[PDB]
Amino acid sequence: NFNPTSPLLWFKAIDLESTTVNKYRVVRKALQEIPRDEGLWKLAVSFEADKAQVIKMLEKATQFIPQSMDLLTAYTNLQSYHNAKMTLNSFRKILPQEPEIWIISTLLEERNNPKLVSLLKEGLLELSKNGYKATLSAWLKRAEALNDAPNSNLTCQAIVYAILEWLRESGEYESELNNVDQILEKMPHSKVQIAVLKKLIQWDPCDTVLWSRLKMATESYEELLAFFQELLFQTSDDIRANMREKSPGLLMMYVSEYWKAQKGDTRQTLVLIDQIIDFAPHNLDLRFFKIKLLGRSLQLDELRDFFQQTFSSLEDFKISGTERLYYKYVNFLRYQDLNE
């Protein structure tokens, strides 16, 4: 009566009242008296079993507290349509929402789960519309918890990508990247962190990142492999070149992964062959794994044929590191295994 405006009293009253109906009544009274108390609204939302009433309550809450995030999320959860989502967006677009409110929209979008490329577009749109405050890797921190939920990790990835793009547009920082890396390292064996790394890799050559990716995969105890496959297939046109230039252990890593995956020793062989074909000057490292596979399988004539094939290619490689010396030794060994 005397102090209707103070929330604490209402809370106390609620605590006191054990019966659910009574509690509800109290909450209603509080709402009537005080409009802004988020906690009270949340409590109200919680109490009820039926649907329409709950929805109404949510709506009321939304109306009253203009920028309550949890309430908004709850509201979104309720209506269960793309039309509904659109409506929500429309409602929200009129309200000023600079900091990090589109994330909810993104989440809503991929509730369907097939679509996932439009997420990126949405992310891109995000900051160009709003009068944004200069921040880097704030989203990531917030994404984390959000990501940790189901049907959310995928959404997070798009957002991350968008953020990265924005950063790139702005200019290379040096510190921001480091911060991001640190964040990733903290709360390890998580998918959103991995996604960031993946995004980075696509953009630019990062052996450290690749190692990091591997580590992440190990922690998880396949995604990486899938990513690699995608890279190979969607764009050996431009990837072969870069890879060739690198002359790295990426290929070796891939081979190892394949080996780990399969005891059937045919798929891996095929992959190796593809890699060999793919690389224009052909990488030296690949052949050893192929040889090993052949040995495992035990196919003398086939092995011989393979070696012959390798030989022809070999004539261009002059003064190349571990080139002839390794292969010839292997050949000798093979010969010894059958005929001296």
Curated annotation (Swiss-Prot):
Compartmental location: Nucleus
Spans of repeat HAT? 1-18, 19-50, 52-81, 83-114, 188-220, 236-268, 298-335
Which stretches are annotated as coiled coil? none
Query: What biological function has been recorded for the protein in this entry?
Result: Participates in pre-mRNA splicing. Part of the U4/U5/U6 tri-snRNP complex, one of the building blocks of the spliceosome.
Summarize subunit and interaction data from the UniProt record for this chain. Answer: Component of the U4/U6-U5 tri-snRNP complex composed of the U4, U6 and U5 snRNAs and at least PRP3, PRP4, PRP6, PRP8, PRP18, PRP31, PRP38, SNU13, SNU23, SNU66, SNU114, SPP381, SMB1, SMD1, SMD2, SMD3, SMX2, SMX3, LSM2, LSM3, LSM4, LSM5, LSM6, LSM7, LSM8, BRR2 and DIB1.
Q: What else is known?
A: Present with 2250 molecules/cell in log phase SD medium.
Protein name per its UniProtKB record: Pre-mRNA-splicing factor 6
> Which gene produces this protein?
PRP6
Please state which portion of the whole protein this structure contains, as first and last residue out of the total length.
301 to 650 of 899
